[PDB]
Structure formats: structure tokens, C-alpha cells
Design a protein around this ligand. Structure first.
Ligand SMILES: Nc1ncnc2c1ncn2[C@@H]1O[C@H](COP(=O)(O)OP(=O)(O)OP(O)(O)=S)[C@@H](O)[C@H]1O
Ligand SMILES: Nc1ncnc2c1ncn2[C@@H]1O[C@H](COP(=O)(O)OP(=O)(O)O)[C@@H](O)[C@H]1O
Ligand SMILES: Nc1ncnc2c1ncn2[C@@H]1O[C@H](COP(=O)(O)OP(=O)(O)O)[C@@H](O)[C@H]1O
Ligand SMILES: Nc1ncnc2c1ncn2[C@@H]1O[C@H](COP(=O)(O)OP(=O)(O)O)[C@@H](O)[C@H]1O
Lengths: 575, 11, 580
């Protein structure tokens, strides 16, 4: 009895919060507990769902007396695994303690042993135990045992074995709905408020549940809700030393979630109106190229968030096309950086093999637990509120395109694992380099002919006609201009200047050098991708060599220019 | 699992 | 031995061990083996929950009551617990000390018998780490010499793989196949067990309910076997009767209660199991006829097949009905299916057969995910029918389907049960089967390539005969043709769409006065011979809802409705009235 703690006695003295909800799940446990055989119940639920608390609720019902007379005199106990494994150091010493407790429980009838995290004690698992004594107590039917096990590790421990599954009844314990969860907070509000004497507004508690699931995406919302609430209350209790701000507002809860999320407060805060209003301004600040596309794309985002009365379909389905590395990927990453979401990257070129298609929605080789599962489907579940970047969509197998249609139309994807993804919030973007390839090729003729083709016709050849109708608007990048590329060179050198600033050496670049580096580095076929290679090997190699051994060890004071006749850069350094 | 054990008398 | 072995004979005196009903053949074979000079160790090999442990425990119960031969009298059965024997050893010889001590006790008593349930475990190292001194090896000399008698219960799969590998230990044991007796013998078994269960819940089970439980369990609870499944539903029924009623309520377990319990186990809506659907069946034909116009011969065929299956005239092993819909697109093929599902209340499973065109993709419908991956997945078709026993399976563009798919349906229609590669048995005899193809419409609609127009009345059937194998067509109940919608029925279709919009507008308060002449013009544009009524969706919404809807949100008239519509000859447009 020393190892275990009587929950029934605990309720009499208090300290158990009144359970709210889960009336059907709680009633189910009592029904199975009254069975002649297989009375032992199981609670298959994820961490934070509230599977441990529902068992506590049963003890409260017994003390309250709102149960049949059979269970009115019954008692419940909670097995402490830590107490049993405290200092034994040998497997089998633990078992002796378990046997002694079973005899103590067996003498008195109407005793229930609530084994929390039953999966740990039974089964070999992955990351110890014997599991020899759990089987006889189940087959003997003397004392009922309530076992809480997660969905994961239950299929590999209970379904694999007949003895444990046969004596245990499975109770699906799903996460509560948003409406149900906010009601629970109201039930628990008097206990938390009494601790620090602060009053919570209805808006803040409702916002906490809604925002927590959207941003945290780590554990289930019931546990997350109580954490942010208690954290905000504790923070509010001691945040101002001089001022006792007994009142609470949405401002306080926003900062608390930002700290654990480690994301800027502005993004975490429910400032969707503010962020959407300045979405273009923030994006345009860092990147000043392709303003025409930004204006069309920025407006498409604001209207997309509204949904036009249709929300089941994915909010974002914009497709981008044009020359490679001319801003197709910069806008996507900068869009995520401004929003603060975690950008995901997948190259369809890599997934151009039928075996690779299976990798996206599962694992061809045998895996244990299917933890890796699909390369993309699992990532979507990990971060549903994040943008999905696809590269070289043109070079993909035909079957892959069929799967894409289901995402935009059906709004959900089913794979071998069976996990569901809420594509409503999910956004999608793609980049197509096929269009630039068509203009690069030369016709089979004595005199070449204009290869410029309408962007719409090019897509029809490589993409099915059943996709452009479901899309919002097509954005195409034709080519950069001299004024845009020239300005970009100035921005890129700043990174080198910032890098040199910490080292303690200054740098000076002539305007003529900047103009010359732009024409060579920029390529129509390859966009701005070779510009980084051209500019880096040109500037980095001479400066790096001199900086180590030479006059530029300390001081800097460099000068760069190019002779007109030579048309080649010249580097000057001052000690 | 099989481990030898060394005892000690009280005195 | 003090706590590892529980004397079943002593336990039976007090109770615990439930009486064994009708296992004379099994017990007779066991008593004969126990009487052998050597190797007198019976083995009970059978599927899960088929009374393997009841025979051993029941033998102790029968011995106490004197229902065994005189040679077997004065015999005590001991139920060894392997887990208790392997718990607390923590030393080189703790396991052997206690295990050998048990054998000494058995050797002392000539009549003592050891009952080891789940005997496959002894082959596994009991207390051997990197050694072969196991429980099985220790008892091998004693079993061969007849010193001790051992009774073991293990599943066929465990017996085949875990057991029988060591031919030494297998030789001593004599396999006794324990199979489920019958659907009817289980009722007798529950009658013998009914008093114990009745006393626990303080309720009385009706004779009809006990029979219903077994019968209802077989139809839906197919994962487990007959004895355990029937008892489990009975146990759950009493418990619900204990908790659901507060007090002074019917104690007797009604037949309806059994249907509720089996429904939750099978996750069935609980409406299909009951036979209270007679009211809906009465006017099912007329109700469905008004919902979808034309092709009356299709609704009557569907209702007649369902009506006969619910009247005891349904096929014993085949599904409720197998039908093929051959007609133009958008002629109500999918309408009779969905409307039937909604009225009946069962689900409408739909599978696109265009996806399953190549041979590599046929395995998906009747196979788990590629390789050996995925948990509760199975065949795409198998998990849907298993999940929903009563449903309406719909297959579109079946002709496009690979030939291998038709071979799968042959056993479905002929036998009514489908077995997945995994090994599970999917029994779907309640689901109606409907397929939709456009094979014949192409031949009939197109005219002959010649000066003379040849007769195409029989051309449609000819395509189906060649496109579908005779074996496939023979299993089908009937082939129903959806005929092109005549002008008379076309008027009804526009009436349904416009009336539907009127209902939506009625809650908002807006009213419409569309003219009958406008209906005719809408019908020509909305209905196409090639596309059927699929384009008709846009015509009603775009011509009527879109102009008025835009005005409602922001227009000359914000609200008040009282709109009217009339055909315009010059503009071929619909009039919009705006009276506040
Ligand atoms: N009706 C309720 N439903 C769910 N949780 C509730 C409810 N009422 C209170 N809670 C609280 O919500 C939290 C639920 O935690 P649980 O999900 O039971 O944790 P757990 O799954 O045992 O955690 P582990 O040990 O990490 S797997 C506790 O703080 C409960 O007291
Ligand atoms: N508008 C722009 N302003 C500045 N640099 C740009 C702009 N658009 C694209 N770039 C540059 O294009 C390059 C793209 O590189 P990379 O991501 O490897 O291209 P890709 O995605 O086509 O393989 C980066 O140097 C990026 O900064
Ligand atoms: N003839 C019978 N008389 C009484 N109970 C029976 C009979 N046949 C089967 N049972 C029931 O079958 C169950 C025993 O199943 P069992 O063989 O122990 O399953 P498993 O093989 O999964 O361990 C008990 O509910 C028992 O009462
Ligand atoms: N006979 C009919 N009466 C009323 N609506 C019909 C009829 N035939 C087709 N429709 C309508 O056609 C729409 C789209 O085509 P669908 O019915 O799916 O075609 P099909 O019946 O050929 O599968 C459905 O929303 C349905 O209401």
C-alpha cells in the first residue's frame, strides 16, 4: 500500500479538480468494470488528452455515490512504477514487490488497480521489465486493472499478444472539441484564479485554445490550454513588481505562448488583419524584384484568406513559373520568414521514380512503427500551418499528378498510415523551369524563328487541363531588367561588408566594378544562380588570400577598379 | 539473468 | 507450488469453474490419453476462444461430480502459472529449485495432473540466459516415463510455429483438435452458463435474446470465434442493464438490448440490425420515384431486391443484389444510389474504377499497402465493407477497370465473402452492388456509317456481352438501362432544381415567380445528349441564383425578394423583379 496511493481517499480530502465532460467515456468504463469477465479496462489515448484524469473522475463518482451499489463501496489505487523500481537494481526484485502488493489488494475485494502508462511495464518496447505478473492477475479475474496506454506502442504490445488484448477492452479516448475544451477551462477557472486572485476574461481563455493548437502543434490542446493559462496567471502575479495587475487580457496570453513557441510576438499574436495588411510591404522591403508578380500575388493572398465561402479546399494553390532562380524560391522563403512559419522543401525531380512516389506516402522497406512513414505526409502532420515548396514539378511521373488533384479537390489525403491532414490551412507553391527551356532551343531551319510562346499554352503541354480551372491565378516571370540586377549586386556585397565589419577591416568597391559584375554573373537561361558563383570566386579568392598573409592582415582599406582596355578587375590594398 | 551471490556472516 | 499451482478440483467445490456443456468427444479422447502407460499428456489445439481452457477446468468440475470413470476418480488437477514461477528468481538456480519441487509433488501423487495453459511459453527460455536449461528440457524425461501427466492448451498458429519445432517435446504431447461445435450448440452452452451471468447482473436473459446474440454475433463480430463472442455480448448486455437504468426499470434483457450491444462492438449504426425498416420499405418505391424522374424500372428493381432480402427470400450466401447500370452520363445512375442510401440511412461507398486500370493497381482494392506495410488498412474495398456491413457499394466506369478486377467480383457475387491477402475474412452479404458503365450509349447514340441507317436496338447488348464476360454477367441479378430523359421528364428535373432553390430562398424570405416558358428554355441549355444533366447544375445556378444573389449582397434591392422571371425572346435572358 505504501507504493500506491489511494485516489478514493484523496478525493475525500480534496485536491482533485472536478471533471467536466467525457460523460460517455466515463460511463463506458463503469459498464466494463461491472463485467463478469474481461472487466479490466484499457484507455487508448494520446499524451495530454486527459486519459489519466478520466480515471480519477471515477473515484470521485464513488465518493459522490452516483454509481451502482456494486461499485459504491469499491476503491481505486494508482500503481507507482517509480516506487517499485526505486533501488532494486536487479530484474526480479521489482517483481517481488508487485506480488506482495497484489496479495494485499487480493484480500480486500472491490479493489481496482489503475496502472498508469501500462505500456512501460509490459512488452519489450523500443527504449527493462519482465511483464510476467500482469498476465496472471488478468486471467484470475480477482482485481480489475485500469491500464492507460498510448495509441503508439499499443499496436506493437497489445495487438501482437492475445492474452493481454483478450482480457482488456479498448476505449478510444479522443481529444476534446474546441467547444468542449473551453468549457473545461471554465470549470477549472475557480481553482487557478483562487491561487493568484486574477480574473480571466472569456475572450482570452477561448483564444488560448484556438491559438495553441494553431501554433504549438506539439501536444494535444487540453494539456496546452492549462499550461498557458497557469503560466499567464503565474506571470501576471509577479510580472509588475510595483503594480498588481489583477486583470488579464489577450496581450498577456500572447507573450506567454510566444516564449514557448520561440516565434516573434507579432506573428504569434492574433494580428491576422495587421499582418495581411502589411504582407506586401514587409515582403517588398527585403526583395524589390518582380513587383508586378508581388502585387498580383499579394492581393491573391488577402482574398484567399477570406475563402470566398469555400474553406474545405486548400487556401493556397498558386503556381509560379519562369526562368530558374529569378525569384521563384526567394518569394516563398521570404513569405514564410515574414509570417514566421517553418518552410518545407521537396524537390519533385528527386521524386521522379515510382519507388520514390511510395516514399512520399510511405516506406518501401519494412519499418517498425512506421515512424518515418511518408516523407511529405508526415511533415504535413508535423507542421500543418506551413507552406509546401515543390521544385521541378514538370519532371514528375504522371501518377504523382493524380495525387495532387485530390489534395486541391478532396482536401484530404489518405496513405498507408492513415493519418489525416487538414489541407484547409495548408498552402502550396510550385516552380516550373520548362518554359525557359522552350525559348532556349533553336528551330530546325535555315533562319531561326521567334520562340516566344504564350505561358498558358506551355502549361497545357506539361500539365493536365483539370488544374488551371481549380487554380486562383497564374503568375509568370518573363525575365529581369538591367535596373533590377544592378541594384541586387549592391545588396549582395553588403553581406561581405557586414562579414568584414566584424573582422575589423573595411572595403571599398568602385561603381564601375558593380556594373561589370552584373552583366557577366546574370544569365537569362540560369537567372541569377550563376551570379553567386561568379561574384564569390571573383571577390572572395583575392581578398581571402591577402587577408591571411599580406598587408591586409589588419586595417583593410582596399580599393577595386577595372581598366577600360583590359576590361578586367584590379585589386588595390593599403596596409 | 543468472548472477552469482557472495554472502557474509554477521560475525 | 504454494502459489504457482491452484487446485482446480478444490476451486470447483467453491465455484469459479463454470460448468462444461457438451464436450464428451473431446473429454473422451483426453481421458483415453491420460490413461496411457507413457506419454499420457493431452494437448488441446484450437482457435482462440473455443473452450480450450474450459475442457481442462471442466474436467476438474466433472471429476468432483463423479461423471468420469472410476480410474480417473480421486484425481487432482493443478493449474501452473508460468509467470509466477518466473517472477522473483533473480538467481542462478531459483527457477530450477521451485520448478523441480513441483515435479516432486506430482511424482508423489500418481493421479495428479498438471494443466499448463499457453504451453508454447515453456519452450521459450523460462530462466535461461544464453543457455538451454529450459522448463521444457527439465520435464522431457518425466513425460516420456509417465511420471507426470501434463495437459496443455495452445493455439494452432502457436502450435505450428512455436510448438512442434522441438520434435522431442512435441512427441510426448497428443494433439486433440478443439473446434467450435456449431452455431446451435453454442446456445445450449450459454444456457448452462446463463445462471452464473444472470446472478452477477441480477437480470434474466430471454430465450430469444440468447439465440439472437449468437446469430447477431456471427453476422457482424467475425474477428473472434463463436463461444467467446456470444458470451462477451451477453456479459456486456447485463452490465448495461446495471448502469443505464437508475432503478425500478425493466431488469429483463430484451432482444433489442442485444442488438445495441453488438452494434457498438461492430460500430454499426444500430438501425440495420433492427427489422423496424418495414415502414420505409412500404413507400420506398414511390418516395424514390418522386426524388428522381424517369427510369422507373431502376428504382423498382432496387427496392424489390432489398424488400425480398428483408423478407427472408434473400440469397443464403450471395449479396443482397448485384446490378449493372448501362446508360448515358447524367441520367440519374448515381442519383438512385445516393437517394437510396439516404432513405435507408446506410452509407454509400464509392470507388473510381478509372484509377484501377493497370494490373499493378488491382492489388490495392484486395490487398494491403505495397510490400507488408500499413496497420488497419487491408484492401481498399475490404476495409470499407468490414467497417460498414450494410452499405451501398458504387463503382463508376467499371468497363475501364482492368480484367483482373472482374475476377475479384466473381467470388464476391458468387460466394458473398472476400478474403484479403492479410488473412482476414470480409463477409458482406448485406451490401448491394451497383456498377455504372457507358458502353452501350456510344453505339446507340452514334448513327451507322452508311446511306442506310442500320438497326441499333440490339447493338447496345452486343457490346456488353463482349465487354463483360458471360460468367460476370450471369452472377448479376439484372442489367437495367437508363433511358434518355424525354421532354416530359425533363420538366420535372428543372422543377426539382428550381423548387430546391426556392426552399433555400424561403428561409431567407426571398420569393420567386419563374414562368413555365422559362423552364423550357432552361432545359435545352441545361440538358445535353452527350453530357446529360451534369451541365444543368451551372445553368440553374448561373442563370437564376447568380444574378439575384449578386443583387442580394449589393444591388438596387438589398432585401425583400418578390422576384419574378420570364423568358426574353430577343436577349434569351431571364427577367429580374426588384420589389422591396
Ligand atoms: N475533462 C478533462 N479532460 C481532460 N483533461 C482534463 C479534464 N479536466 C481536467 N483536465 C486536466 O487536463 C490534464 C490532462 O492530462 P492527461 O492527459 O491526463 O495527462 P497524461 O496523458 O497522463 O500525461 P503523460 O503521463 O505525460 S502520457 C490534467 O491537468 C487534468 O487535470
Ligand atoms: N529579386 C531578387 N533579388 C535578389 N536576389 C534574387 C532575387 N530573385 C532571386 N534572387 C537570387 O536568386 C538565387 C537563387 O538561388 P537558388 O535558391 O539556388 O535557386 P533555385 O531555387 O532556382 O535553384 C539567390 O542568390 C537569390 O538571392
Ligand atoms: N462448452 C463450454 N462450456 C462453458 N464455457 C465454454 C464452453 N466452450 C467455450 N466456453 C467459454 O470459452 C471461454 C474460454 O476461452 P479460452 O479457450 O480460454 O480462450 P483462449 O484460447 O483465447 O485463451 C470461456 O468464456 C468459456 O466459458
Ligand atoms: N434523372 C435525374 N433527375 C434529377 N437529377 C438528375 C438526374 N440525373 C442526373 N441528375 C443530376 O445530375 C447531377 C450530376 O450528374 P450525376 O447525377 O452524378 O450523373 P449520373 O447519374 O450519370 O452518375 C447530380 O447532382 C444529379 O442530381
Amino acid at each position: 500500500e505504501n507504493f500506491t496511493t489511494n485516489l478514493n481517499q484523496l478525493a475525500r480530502v480534496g485536491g482533485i479538480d472536478p471533471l467536466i465532460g467525457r460523460e460517455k467515456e466515463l460511463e463506458r468504463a463503469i459498464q466494463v468494470l461491472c463485467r463478469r469477465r474481461k472487466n479490466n479496462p484499457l484507455l487508448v489515448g494520446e499524451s495530454g488528452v486527459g486519459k489519466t484524469a478520466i480515471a480519477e473522475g471515477l473515484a470521485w463518482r464513488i465518493v459522490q455515490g452516483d454509481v451502482p451499489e456494486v461499485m459504491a463501496d469499491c476503491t481505486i489505487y494508482s500503481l507507482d512504477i517509480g516506487s517499485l523500481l526505486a533501488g532494486t537494481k536487479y530484474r526480479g526484485d521489482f517483481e517481488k514487490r508487485f506480488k506482495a502488493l497484489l496479495k494485499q489488494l487480493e484480500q480486500d475485494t472491490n479493489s481496482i488497480l489503475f496502472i498508469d502508462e501500462i505500456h512501460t511495464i509490459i512488452g519489450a518496447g523500443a527504449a527493462v521489465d519482465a511483464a510476467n505478473l500482469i498476465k496472471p492477475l488478468l486471467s484470475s479475474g480477482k482485481i480489475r486493472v485500469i491500464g492507460s496506454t498510448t495509441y503508439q506502442e499499443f499496436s506493437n504490445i497489445f495487438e501482437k499478444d492475445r492474452a493481454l488484448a483478450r482480457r482488456f477492452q479498448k476505449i478510444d479516448i479522443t481529444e476534446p472539441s474546441i467547444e468542449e475544451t473551453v468549457q473545461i477551462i471554465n470549470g477549472l477557472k475557480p481553482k487557478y484564479e483562487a491561487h493568484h486572485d486574477v480574473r480571466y476574461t472569456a475572450k482570452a481563455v477561448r483564444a488560448a485554445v484556438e491559438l495553441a493548437v494553431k501554433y504549438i502543434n506539439d501536444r494535444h490542446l487540453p494539456d496546452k490550454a492549462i499550461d498557458v493559462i497557469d503560466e499567464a496567471g503565474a506571470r501576471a502575479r509577479l510580472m509588475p513588481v510595483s503594480k498588481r495587475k489583477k486583470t488579464v487580457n489577450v496581450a498577456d496570453i500572447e507573450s506567454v505562448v510566444a516564449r514557448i513557441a520561440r516565434i516573434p510576438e507579432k506573428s504569434v499574436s492574433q494580428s491576422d488583419r495587421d499582418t495581411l495588411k502589411n504582407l506586401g510591404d514587409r515582403l517588398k522591403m527585403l526583395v524589390f524584384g518582380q513587383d508586378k508578380a508581388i502585387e498580383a500575388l499579394t492581393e491573391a493572398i488577402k482574398m484567399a484568406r477570406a475563402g470566398l465561402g469555400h474553406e474545405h479546399k486548400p487556401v493556397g494553390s498558386f503556381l509560379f513559373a519562369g526562368p530558374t532562380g529569378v525569384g521563384k524560391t526567394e518569394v516563398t522563403v521570404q513569405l514564410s520568414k515574414a509570417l514566421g512559419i517553418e518552410l518545407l522543401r521537396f524537390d519533385m525531380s528527386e521524386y521522379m521514380e515510382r519507388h520514390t512516389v511510395s516514399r512520399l506516402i510511405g516506406a518501401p522497406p519494412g519499418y517498425v512503427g512506421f515512424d518515418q512513414g511518408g516523407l511529405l505526409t508526415d511533415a504535413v502532420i508535423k507542421h500543418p500551418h506551413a507552406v509546401l515548396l515543390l521544385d521541378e514539378i514538370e519532371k514528375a511521373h504522371p501518377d504523382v499528378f493524380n495525387i495532387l488533384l485530390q489534395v486541391m479537390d478532396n482536401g484530404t489525403l489518405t496513405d498507408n498510415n492513415g493519418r489525416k491532414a487538414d489541407f484547409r490551412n495548408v498552402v502550396l507553391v510550385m516552380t516550373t523551369n520548362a518554359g525557359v527551356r522552350e525559348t532556349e532551343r533553336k528551330s530546325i531551319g535555315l533562319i531561326h524563328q521567334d520562340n516566344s510562346t504564350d505561358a498558358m499554352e506551355e502549361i497545357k503541354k506539361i500539365f493536365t487541363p483539370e488544374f488551371r480551372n481549380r487554380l486562383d491565378n497564374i503568375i509568370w516571370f518573363d525575365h529581369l531588367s538591367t535596373d533590377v540586377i544592378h541594384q541586387v549586386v549592391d545588396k549582395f556585397i553588403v553581406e561581405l561588408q557586414v562579414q568584414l565589419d566584424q573582422k575589423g577591416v573595411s572595403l571599398e568597391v568602385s561603381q564601375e566594378a558593380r556594373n561589370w559584375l552584373a552583366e557577366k554573373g546574370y544569365d537569362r537561361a540560369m537567372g541569377a544562380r550563376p551570379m553567386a558563383r561568379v561574384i564569390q570566386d571573383n571577390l572572395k579568392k583575392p581578398l581571402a588570400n591577402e587577408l591571411l598573409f599580406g598587408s591586409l592582415v589588419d586595417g583593410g582599406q582596399v580599393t577595386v577598379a577595372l581598366d577600360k582596355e583590359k576590361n578586367e578587375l584590379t585589386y588595390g590594398f593599403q596596409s | 539473468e543468472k548472477v552469482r551471490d557472495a554472502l557474509k556472516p554477521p560475525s
